[PDB]
Amino acid sequence: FKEIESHLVSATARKDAVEALIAYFAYHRLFEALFRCTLIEKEAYAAAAARLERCPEALRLAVRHGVTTIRRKTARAIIDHIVQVLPPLLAGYVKVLYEFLDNPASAENIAALSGEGWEVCVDFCIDVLSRFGTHVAVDVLSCLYMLCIAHNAPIQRKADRLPHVVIQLLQLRQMKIGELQKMAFATFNIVFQRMQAEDVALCKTLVKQVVPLLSHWWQPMLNSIRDEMLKTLYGTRLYIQALLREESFPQDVEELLDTLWCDYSRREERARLQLDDITFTNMLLPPDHPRTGIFSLRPHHTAGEQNWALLENLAILEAAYSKHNRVHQKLHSLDPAVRLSALQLIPFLTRHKKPSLEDVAETLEDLSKHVTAKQAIVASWAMLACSSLAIHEVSRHPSLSSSWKQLWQLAVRSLSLPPISRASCVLLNSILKANLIPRHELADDINQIVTTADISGPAILVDASLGLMLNLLRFRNNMFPNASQATSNHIIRWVFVRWSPAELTYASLHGTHATPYDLVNLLRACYGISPLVMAQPLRLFNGPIVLHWKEQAEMEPFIRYLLLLAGSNASRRLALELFYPKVEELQELAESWQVSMERLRSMVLACLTGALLLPDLVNINSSLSRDLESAVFSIVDATLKVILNSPPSENLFGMILASSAPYIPHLIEPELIALKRERPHLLKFFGKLSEALYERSRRETLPRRDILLSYTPEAFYLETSLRIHFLDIIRLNDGEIGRIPEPIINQLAGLSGEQFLCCREFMREIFTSDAIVPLGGATTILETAGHIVSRYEYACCEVALCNCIDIMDSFINLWTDNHFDIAEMAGDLYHYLVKQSLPNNSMSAAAQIRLASLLLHLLEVKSEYASNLGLPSSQSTLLKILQDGPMKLKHYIGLEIPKLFGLYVLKTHDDIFVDVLEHLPSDPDVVEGLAFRLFVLAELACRWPTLLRRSIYHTFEI
């Protein structure tokens, strides 16, 4: 290689050196060799062509092998060589670029001190495209995209020609479909997400251009292309509603509406938003979840998000087009698939249409026409649409009251067919909650349902069946207080007649619908004890579409502004008798196993339901107690042993964690005390699960670098594993509550650089909670969390910075109390983040937000720490950040700045207000700046009355 290095910088030397390199496949020197060798051959211009094609092939194969131990010096060197040698060698050089950018930390660390080199690369690719091989063109758009996904990529500078380039390319209505269009739409999404609240004019023009081009490349791979176009529609959802309120665009948008309808209506039954992609359960799902009026997207469904995305976006664009009745016409359509699609689009749309009395009445008449459609699909969806409309204030008008009776009627009989036993139940429940029919017309039918329970019972025992049965139990303990054991005993009989877990039709068809939460809540009601607690939002993971929507979710108010738009013992023994056979049959089915997803999931839901109500069914103590516990836990053990010895491709542990999570508590001391007092059998379950986890680990990089990495499947599984470990240790120690168990910390500080970032939400959750941590605990945790941030592969990534800021925030009051051993570490890290990380153009938007929160919290504890360490004051850093920062950070701070005036005596508020206003945006050519200024002044005013005078004065001033 040394003599070969001299050989490169005589064809037997060059071609031979490249052959020896290919055989091969500090570095800086060989890289110089290759560069100047290609240059010597370039000036020394078919053999010439072959040697030119073959030298940077060796180059690119070297940049796929030292691209790990490369640094910014070698980065700039390679980049300037690529842009200097070329004024033939397109594909080789572009390949070197592609393989240099494939490593994300590379294209992020080039977004350092200036953006000179980043702009060099982006302009390289823009010029290359605007010249436009064809596959090389795809690689050009790919490396352009790979540059644009860097949340500290300075885009605003080279943001004039870039979108026009990308969406000028796409206007070509040929080159049937491939990576080209997927990458076109990916760069569009990212650049638009940047420039969504800066350069409003550019954006309105762009959307006026890409609402047409979207109604063409939606020709009815294609999975990912429909996904990118649905993300695009999620973005543009506001410019469309603004433009329609401001005349080609109406024609174009209507044509696009009809392309969406024509595409969705020929999707007959497999992938058409099946009725198993929604749940009617009354759990505490998080607020940012996707939901519509009655149902909501089934948790942990990364496979049914595209259909919900399409229907959600279509409902929004339709209620935003009929604003400036396509749906009722399509409802009276002829082709049955069109009527089915118009039956699906009723709840999504009524979530935001605010219909009038005539429209509600008419649509309801037609739906009562469609309810009896002899068809599981159509009758079901029709009843769901009806029960979506039945939850207004418009529906409670007498002009259609008998109509409700009709629908009630058309459901009271439609309860015994397992095809439509779910939707029908929903309907009943809806009418029994909104009170559209008085409490004497509907008493005989309820008596029939609850006393008979074999005809006009909810034939299937799913989420909505249990909801309705609970509402009926309460109705009948409210009207006929005498004969309440009748209700409770009929209820228990129905529950244990319908709940057959160890059967193929149940376990495979509607096993996913029914959850242990609903079962045990109904049973605890009919005994008479109490609900399950479930006092916090469920934890779940999502897929790309919903995550991307969760990115553009905090900033939608600023875009709606910038755009200007003893008997109990009888019943318990009854239930125990009726229940034990279920466990016996389950244990026989389990002994046979020493297998699919559905049978195994049903068995684990059954063992959860068993472990939940053991503390119920032991006060019986009629010798069917010991046997019951031993049998339940024998099922649990057999299940775990099927789970372990299995391929990690089914991912059964995904199933068990996803099912068992909603019962894991919050990790504070009082809740972990009430888990040792009320539900201990759940704790024994969690112990067995922890053992299986430990052992499966004994047997054997980053999916996304956003702030949302902790909502992807990988992160959810890691956080759940560690909460399970935590609960197990707490059970065993029995008094080591709260005090973070040193084994848990040693499992925290014994992970990889890819996982410490994944479990950061778990670290936040434990540490923020009041919990004695060992000295070495906080010290070691902070040592490792800091070490992640100084590796040149994480020095720029968003997630590492956010995580180290959060961990410093967790122990805010150790270093700012005394001088410990940790105070030096936090000093070093504060200094590196403030003085060094921030002006280097390395902190991203979410990193700057997390640092703003760190500072705003620091002022409430020390308020001068940054001086006693030798830096400018914290407030100085905060406002310096406010002046220069991507509008997302400006919005966050302006929203949480009116809390900065809570740490100061009332005498000095106009002084602080002068100081702040010194650091706002103000320039007449920039209208976004003035918009932000008026925004923050309105916020201060609407919170602090002291600053109302100056807020109004400066609002009228500009």
Cα separation, 152 vs 53, whole angstroms: 35
Q: CB of 682 within 8 A of CB of 717? A: no
Nearest to 351 by CA among 395, 392, 292: 292
Looking at residue 753, its amino acid is G
Q: CB of 534 within 8 A of CB of 481? A: no
Helix (H, G, I), strand (E, B) or coil at 296: strand
Nearest to 831 by CA among 871, 795, 868, 867: 871
Cα separation, 767 vs 779, whole angstroms: 13
Phi/psi of residue 497, each to 5°?
-85, -40
Report the largest interatomic distance among the alpha carbons of the chain, rounded to a whole angstrom. Answer: 107
How many Cα neighbours within 13 Å face the side chain of 267? 18
**How far is CA 92 from its chain centroid?**
38
Count of beta carbons in the 10 Å neighbourhood of residue 103: 17
Cα separation, 643 vs 30, whole angstroms: 52
Q: Which helix (H) or strand (E) holds 234?
A: helix 222-243
**How far is CA 249 from its chain centroid?**
32
Please give the radius of gyration of the chain, using alpha carbons only, rounded to the nearest integer: 32
Phi/psi of residue 527, each to 5°?
-60, -55
Helix (H, G, I), strand (E, B) or coil at 843: coil
Count of beta carbons in the 10 Å neighbourhood of residue 621: 10
Count of beta carbons in the 10 Å neighbourhood of residue 47: 8
Query: How buried is residue 121: exposed, middle or buried, by Cβ count under 10 Å (0-12/13-18/19+)?
Result: buried
Cα separation, 465 vs 422, whole angstroms: 7
Q: Which helix (H) or strand (E) holds 215?
A: none
Query: How buried is residue 405: exposed, middle or buried, by Cβ count under 10 Å (0-12/13-18/19+)?
Result: middle
Between the CA atoms of 445, 447, 451 and 457, what dihedral angle is there, to the nearest 10 degrees?
30
Cα separation, 246 vs 836, whole angstroms: 47
Helix (H, G, I), strand (E, B) or coil at 470: helix
Helices 516-527 & 597-612 angle (0-180, nearest 10):
30
Cα separation, 547 vs 849, whole angstroms: 19
Q: What is the DSSP string of 649-714?
A: TT-HHHHHHHHHGGG----SHHHHHHTTTS-HHHHHHHHHHHHHHHHHHHH---S--STTGGGSHH
Helix (H, G, I), strand (E, B) or coil at 897: coil
Count of residues in the chain: 958
Nearest to 325 by CA among 363, 368, 357, 351: 363
Helix (H, G, I), strand (E, B) or coil at 295: strand
Alpha helices in 2-134 (DSSP H): 2-8, 11-24, 27-43, 47-62, 72-85, 90-102, 104-109, 116-131
Cα separation, 446 vs 469, whole angstroms: 10
Query: How buried is residue 909: exposed, middle or buried, by Cβ count under 10 Å (0-12/13-18/19+)?
Result: middle
Nearest to 621 by CA among 632, 629, 633: 629
Cα separation, 473 vs 458, whole angstroms: 13
How many Cα neighbours within 13 Å face the side chain of 219? 11
Strand pairing class (291-292; 278-279): unpaired
Tokens (6 digits) for 272: 């058409």
* DSSP bridge pairs for 292: 295
What resolution in angstroms, rounded to 1 decimal? 3.4
Cα separation, 841 vs 835, whole angstroms: 11
Cα separation, 478 vs 620, whole angstroms: 27
Q: CB of 110 within 8 A of CB of 120? A: no
Phi/psi of residue 255, each to 5°?
-60, -35
Looking at residue 242, its amino acid is A
* DSSP bridge pairs for 297: 278
How many Cα neighbours within 13 Å face the side chain of 668? 9
Count of beta carbons in the 10 Å neighbourhood of residue 481: 8
**How far is CA 696 from its chain centroid?**
28
Alpha helices in 296-335 (DSSP H): 305-321, 326-331
Q: Is the dihedral of CA 881, 887, 892, 894 positive or negative?
A: positive
Q: Which helix (H) or strand (E) holds 165?
A: helix 161-169
Could you give the angle at the alpha carbon of 325 between the alpha carbons of 323 and 326, nearest 5°? 110
Cα separation, 867 vs 625, whole angstroms: 66
3-state secondary structure 715-744: HHHHHHHHHHHHHHHHHHHCCCCCCCCHHH
Cα separation, 259 vs 186, whole angstroms: 21
Nearest to 769 by CA among 796, 738, 801, 792: 738
Phi/psi of residue 281, each to 5°?
-70, 150
Q: CB of 430 within 8 A of CB of 391? A: yes
Phi/psi of residue 348, each to 5°?
-50, -40
Nearest to 53 by CA among 76, 45, 131: 45
Q: Is the dihedral of CA 507, 298, 606, 578 positive or negative?
A: negative
Tokens (6 digits) for 149: 């996904």
Place of tokens 């497999």: 270
Q: CB of 570 within 8 A of CB of 620? A: no
Q: CB of 466 within 8 A of CB of 428? A: no
Cα separation, 740 vs 245, whole angstroms: 56
Cα separation, 898 vs 948, whole angstroms: 12
How many Cα neighbours within 13 Å face the side chain of 491? 33
Q: CB of 835 within 8 A of CB of 870? A: no
Alpha helices in 351-462 (DSSP H): 357-370, 376-389, 401-412, 421-434, 444-452
Place of tokens 């496949």: 25
* DSSP bridge pairs for 295: 292
Cα separation, 96 vs 341, whole angstroms: 49
Place of tokens 């605890």: 524
808 backbone φψ class: left, alpha, beta (φ>0; ψ -120 to 50): alpha
Sequence-separated (6 or more) residues with CB below 8 Å from residue 696: 644, 653
Looking at residue 56, its amino acid is P
Cα separation, 267 vs 397, whole angstroms: 37
- Report which DSSP code applies to 453: -
Count of beta carbons in the 10 Å neighbourhood of residue 701: 10
**How far is CA 831 from its chain centroid?**
33
Sequence-separated (6 or more) residues with CB below 8 Å from residue 592: none
889 backbone φψ class: left, alpha, beta (φ>0; ψ -120 to 50): alpha
Query: For the chain, give me the number of helices (H) and strands (E)?
Result: 48, 3
First to last CA, the chain: 68
Sequence-separated (6 or more) residues with CB below 8 Å from residue 32: 9, 77
Tokens (6 digits) for 352: 């935001």
- Report which DSSP code applies to 158: T
Cα separation, 401 vs 411, whole angstroms: 16
Nearest to 663 by CA among 531, 514, 538, 499: 538
Query: How buried is residue 832: exposed, middle or buried, by Cβ count under 10 Å (0-12/13-18/19+)?
Result: middle
Place of tokens 């280097």: 840
Nearest to 197 by CA among 931, 936, 884: 931
Q: CB of 739 within 8 A of CB of 745? A: no
Cα separation, 513 vs 463, whole angstroms: 6
Q: CB of 491 within 8 A of CB of 473? A: yes
CA distances from 401 to 361, 407, 434 (A): 10, 10, 13
Helix (H, G, I), strand (E, B) or coil at 484: coil
- Lateral strand order in the sheet of 295-297: 278-279, 295-297, 291-292
Place of tokens 């995305």: 309
Q: CB of 693 within 8 A of CB of 699? A: no
- Report which DSSP code applies to 292: E
Q: CB of 502 within 8 A of CB of 582? A: yes
Cα separation, 423 vs 882, whole angstroms: 52
3-state secondary structure 252-279: HHHHHHHHHHHHHHCCCCCCCCCCCCEE
Nearest to 499 by CA among 517, 511, 485, 487: 511
Cα separation, 157 vs 148, whole angstroms: 13
Q: What is the DSSP string of 183-210?
A: HHHHHHHHHHHHTTSS-HHHHHHHHHHH
Cα separation, 112 vs 124, whole angstroms: 18
Cα separation, 454 vs 468, whole angstroms: 15
- Breaks in the chain (C–N beyond 2.5 Å) sit after 9, 25, 45, 87, 132, 220, 246, 324, 565, 594, 700
